[PDB]
Amino acid sequence: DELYRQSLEIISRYLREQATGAKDTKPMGRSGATSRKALETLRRVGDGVQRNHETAFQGMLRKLDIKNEDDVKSLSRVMIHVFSDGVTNWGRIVTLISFGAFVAKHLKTINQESCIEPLAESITDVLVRTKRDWLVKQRGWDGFVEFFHVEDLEG
Ligand SMILES: CN1CC/C=C/[C@H](O)[C@@H]2CC[C@H]2CN2C[C@@]3(CCCc4cc(Cl)ccc43)COc3ccc(cc32)[C@@](O)(C(=O)O)CC1=O
């Protein structure tokens, strides 16, 4: 399942990088060029989402009250409720992953870094297993990179 594997790699790297503030220097697996570009795109667009919706992000984090492994496990149901049960577009996918990064940073701050990888898996499961048809129709991570591509300015 190449789409699942690629998705998990991109999402896991972004969440870990957000939490630690350090780039992972290990090579990507399969489809490395696209995955690198996808991660670069999340760095740009995801960071903006977290700031544009800072108050709402903080509010939801507070409401969720994430302390430990069991709370992190409980998030799948919430993601299905909020993300899966609605329209699908790249913006909503970016928000799913960006709020994930916001939770990952919280996990670092409460010294529960071990829960970041399970969190990344949960987000990937929700995205790929509930929206595969859409993702395939939209050309997967190549489509993601194409959708957010910015042309160079003249001059
Ligand atoms: C205009 N916006 C962005 C501002 C809305 C902020 C919301 O109050 C709340 C703060 C987090 C967001 C709720 N979640 C966050 C949520 C749902 C809460 C649990 C959760 C946990 C993780 Cl690890 C990742 C994501 C999520 C599901 O992902 C979302 C995707 C799309 C939208 C909202 C999502 C979103 O698409 C939606 O609200 O439907 C976001 C949207 O329209």
DSSP per residue, 41-62: HHHHHHHHHHHHTHHHHHHHHH
* Mutational pocket test of ligand 1: of 96, 108, 130, the residue with most ligand atoms within 8 Å of the beta carbon: 96
74 three-class SS: coil
Half-sphere exposure of 72 (CA within 13 A, CB side): 23
d(CA 99, CA 51): 11
Q: Are 2 and 31 in contact (CB under 8 A)?
A: yes
Phi, psi of 40 (to 5 degrees): -60, -40
Question: Would you state the structure tokens that stand for residue 67, as one six-digit string?
Answer: 């302390």
Give whole-number Cα distances, 62 to 57, 65, 87, 94, in Å: 9, 5, 25, 21
96 Cβ inside 6 Å of ligand 1: yes
| Whether the Cβ atoms of residue 141 and residue 42 lie closer than 8 Å to each other | no
Q: For ligand 1, say whether the CB of 14 is within 6 Å of any of its atoms.
A: no
For residue 84, give the nearest of 144, 25, 125 by alpha carbon.
Answer: 125
- Domains of the chain in sequence order: 1-148 (1.10.437.10)
Rg (CA), the chain: 15
DSSP category for residue 34: H
Provide the total of helices (H) and of strands (E) in the chain, helices listed first: 8, 0
How many angstroms does the Cα of residue 146 sit away from the middle of ligand 1?
23
Q: How many CB atoms lie within 10 A of CB 54?
A: 11
- Which residue out of 66, 69, 82 has the highest number of ligand 1 atoms within 8 Å of its CB and is therefore the one to mutate? 82
- CB of 141 within 6 A of ligand 1: the answer is no
Chain mean position to CA 135: 14
* Residue 30: DSSP 8-state: T
66's tokens = 């994430």
Structural contact between residues 25 and 51, judged by C-beta atoms closer than 8 angstroms: no
